[PDB]
Design a protein around this ligand. Structure first.
Ligand SMILES: [Zn+2]
Ligand SMILES: [Zn+2]
Ligand SMILES: [Zn+2]
Ligand SMILES: [Zn+2]
Ligand SMILES: [Zn+2]
Ligand SMILES: [Zn+2]
Ligand SMILES: [Zn+2]
Ligand SMILES: [Zn+2]
Lengths: 116, 116
């Protein structure tokens, strides 16, 4: 599943209120939004999660069921992207006790020193 | 009502996704949270809105209906307060076309020059 490529909200460093946690999560897969797109109805989903639902399930929003098309998919406003891209997350790599921002995460994972 | 003392979310400068807007709103009055407190169940309400509901309605969370007491009411985590206190809002005073942060709002309103 997308769990192999997406981050779980339980990796969030900060203990945020539940509705806020929900606001930065994909409304289909429930992971922290990865490449978020916004429907005409202002709901959020990872670009891949929504496109698949529109195909296999129909042209309706998974959240509210209002007509939804791939061509309607935009990027969330900048200020929202800023809040999301800044979330601090606890890296789960064994013995690593480091917390990094969502935008700096992939770099942190890669930069991890391998065994060899 | 609290509408005389609370700000409507339609005064928000930025057009945020609906679930995020919901996250920074009082789950009882629906205004932008004013002096937010968090229930044990991680839900948010203006300090005055929740205490009245606990009195007149019962000791249960308006959002989820899980037992709720005044003594359980804490302040939201700091990082959440930072996001909330920074929201940009469009002052509705006639001819004023100024946008200011939530924490600087009361100062902006007061500093408004009167007629006289
Ligand atoms: Zn996912
Ligand atoms: Zn997703
Ligand atoms: Zn929708
Ligand atoms: Zn690490
Ligand atoms: Zn209110
Ligand atoms: Zn309220
Ligand atoms: Zn609750
Ligand atoms: Zn003004």
């Amino acid at each position: 599943n997308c769990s192999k490529i997406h981050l779980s909200t339980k990796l969030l460093a900060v203990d945020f209120p539940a509705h806020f946690v929900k606001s930065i999560s994909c409304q289909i897969c429930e992971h922290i939004l990865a490449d978020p797109v916004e429907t005409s109805c202002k709901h959020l989903f990872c670009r891949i999660c929504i496109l698949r639902c529109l195909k296999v399930m129909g042209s309706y929003c998974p959240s509210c069921r209002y007509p939804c098309f791939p061509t309607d998919l935009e990027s969330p406003v900048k200020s929202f992207l800023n809040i999301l891209n800044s979330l601090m997350v606890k890296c789960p790599a064994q013995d690593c006790n480091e917390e990094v921002s969502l935008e700096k995460y992939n770099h942190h994972v890669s930069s991890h020193k391998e065994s060899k």
